[PDB]
Design a protein around this ligand. Structure first.
Ligand SMILES: COc1cc2c(cc1NS(=O)(=O)c1ccc(Br)cc1C)n(C)c(=O)n2C
Length: 113
């Protein structure tokens, strides 16, 4: 830990995004055991555990890169699932609530060098 304000802002933001996912639907990768066709449709799977792993290998260099991976969690879920599903509805709610989180977090990242 050589802690930096930007990396700390990303950690905090990631925690706030995960609090919005109250069902833990997006906490871990979509399980290929349960969803065998998932990678026929989804080129770049993403989830909050993969984001946490990326964060702590310093792969997020700016706020936009981090935001892009969050947006993949949502877009993959809307692409794969039918509208009338728990997963689709959850992704729409996460889009709304997560968007509010990232809007706030971006303002901080803008004050930051
Ligand atoms: C949390 O587990 C899952 C998450 C997802 C997911 C599938 C699962 N796991 S799962 O065993 O298929 C499952 C199926 C039905 C219900 Br109801 C709940 C789960 C977790 N898909 C297709 C997604 O897009 N997401 C985000």
């Amino acid at each position: 830990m050589q802690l930096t304000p930007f990396l700390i802002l990303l950690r905090k933001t990631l925690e706030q995004l995960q609090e919005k996912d109250t069902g833990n639907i997006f906490s871990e990768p979509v399980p290929l055991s349960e969803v065998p066709d998932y990678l026929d449709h989804i080129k770049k799977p993403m989830d909050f555990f993969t984001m946490k792993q990326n964060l702590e290998a310093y792969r997020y260099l700016n706020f936009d890169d981090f935001e892009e991976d969050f947006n993949l969690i949502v877009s993959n879920c809307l692409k794969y699932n039918a509208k009338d599903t728990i997963f689709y509805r959850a992704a729409v709610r996460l889009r709304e609530q997560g968007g509010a989180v990232l809007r706030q977090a971006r303002r901080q990242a803008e004050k930051m060098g």
